[model samples]
Target: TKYAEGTQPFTVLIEGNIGSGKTTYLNHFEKYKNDICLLTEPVEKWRNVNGVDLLELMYKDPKKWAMPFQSYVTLTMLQSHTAPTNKKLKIMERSIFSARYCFVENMRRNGSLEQGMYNTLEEWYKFIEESIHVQADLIIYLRTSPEVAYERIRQRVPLKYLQELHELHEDWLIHQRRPQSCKVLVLDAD
Candidate 1:
């Protein structure tokens, strides 16, 4: 641990649908800048990896780019999770949890990610889960109705995809079907 003794901050994660205002929730903590360390999703990196927009690549041809895009996403989220900070509280916009449970799961079900690639990604996730100690003291779930989430992200993603993702979030966070440790605070963002 690069952090000095007793300096590891209490980590919190914000999770939600694509348009569920997780960023807005993270932004509200900006006022506590002196005591809180904020790490937004590395979307800028996803938009430009060696000058190529991996996000757009995934959207345009998911069958081809889904594996690569999700792989990079996992890596970037791992970086965010383990990033060093001296603040008393460290909050991240998203986490590897959602990347694996929501996005990767959705892609695998929709046939965008092939079975072999999906298994490979799962292997990576399992290895990380066993080897890395990503801290999660708390989780804030920005719960939003599918209709509301769909309207907010209408231009970017299809309603059906959003609907599917919404169910995934619900199952993972609301239904508590997935494996987790930290307590989740669900907010009605709708």
Candidate 2:
């Protein structure tokens, strides 16, 4: 009867470098919060687009492949941002802002995204931030070493593009020294 007061819906976003146990943690969280909906990035199923696979491109030729990789990731984030409101809590494996971080880092590394594209993306990010008030009630970031992340990737994913992600993850972690937000919690991935 106490829970019947109405749904205490909360949105939680889990962020971590690739192969940093994001999926595993999310799975456990989903099991624990059995009433919530769990959302993860959709696997690339489009066969018509060349180098659309993030993992494959990361290994074959990261510089030439970063754009598509960023594009797909951005699209996924957009979708998550627009998910229908629910009475039950929603738990997402990654937040929309994570895509922006990935895109900026990949563009800087590959020198693929031009100034115009970069400016446009920043503007878009700002617009999305204003248009949607779907900020996560809580954010959990997992920090792990690149070596550990790479090993986990090898065990789980077979694609080569994942190597790019691993490298980016390593680079990002090194520079990610910002203070945690009021709603954010950083966890050690040792």
Candidate 3:
């Protein structure tokens, strides 16, 4: 099948728990760097957005900063999702869906995000879902055990948090709890 000139690329979203070899997986695609666009997660922006270390703030006091952190993640991920590219294959490190299904949902489950805050975030996701063209052609889930991922995390996050994230990823990617249509390919990264 052929697409119109300048059309959106065949986007591939790589999703996984933190430190689950996602960056390494994306690196393997470096071979196609010239022919495709590889959008890594904008961690630099999360680390220093206007001189604010949002990720640190969230980690320090998740109860207070998780909502703001997730909000920012939403914005940055939206940028990645809609980034302009002339290449036909666009692969991203993460996606807005992970921000919502895994991180935000984890925050809500752990009672970090207040009920009102969670609802607002859900509303934001709904708005984006209806209006934006968030391209997701294929999803590659790098499955790893929480213990394995915990050892590789950049920051020393609590084991409980990693377990929660692992469960969420399993729920979304393995169990298929959400009503989604994207094709997923699971890989045993551990």
Candidate 4:
């Protein structure tokens, strides 16, 4: 189950608002560095239609789509973890924990996830937290104001769902207390 082992299996998690340049950074970083693995968010490969984006479906009905999204990401993360690390670093566009954030936020906002659904999501989150033991050696947070994030979303995403995403990202930042293990580097988006 292992390909190669690296001297330092450093994993980095890039956290930020929807259009906060996380993916851009990872893409550029991978290009410059040869010894790095870049893990990106699942692109709903199977559900792609000729002209429509499948992400719209997830955004429209998150309660129905959340589990599938989470599962896809979890499997991807596990596969990345199992890849032989020849001392190279792994940079994940978003942390696995980000899925939990999405689940809770989406359900809470959409009013589709009832108490039972919330409980189920919580349980699933706990299981995922335990099973995925790999943690980011460093977390880079692109802390941006709601206004700025919204504007960026407008320019980049041009979708109504992204407005919702902006709001949720802002809300999560407000309530989120930084974890002890995470060495967070904050960049202002103002």
- Tens digits of per-residue lDDT for model 3 on 1-190? 2222245789999999988988888888889889999999999999998999999999899889998999999999988888788898999998999999998998998899999999999999988877777888899999999998988875547888899999998999989997575999999985
For model 4, what is the alpha-carbon lDDT of residue 69? 48
- Candidate 2 TM-score over all chains jointly: 0.69
lDDT of 2 by residue, 92-177 (tens): 87755666665465566556666666666667767765665544677777776666777887776433445565455444444454
Q: Would you estimate the TM-scores of all the predictions?
A: 0.93, 0.69, 0.92, 0.71
Residues 1-190 of candidate 4 have per-residue lDDT tens digits of: 2233333378777777677767666777766456677667555442553554445665777667654544555555555555555546777766555555653556556665556666766786567555555546887777765566567656664445455665555444445542345666667755
Question: Clash totals for all models, in order?
Answer: 0, 6, 0, 7
lDDT, residue 150, model 2:
74
RMSD of each: 2.3, 6.5, 3.2, 4.6
**Candidate 4 error regions (>4 Å):** 1-8, 44-54, 157-180
What overall lDDT goes with each candidate model? 0.88, 0.62, 0.88, 0.60
Which regions of candidate 2 are displaced past 4 Å?
A: 1-8, 32-34, 45-65, 157-182
lDDT comparing candidate 4 with the true structure? 0.60
Q: How far is candidate 4 from the true structure (C-alpha RMSD, Å)?
A: 4.6
Scanning candidate 2 in windows of ten residues, the lowest lDDT window is 1-10
Positional deviation of residue 15's Cα in model 1 after best superposition, in angstroms: 0.6
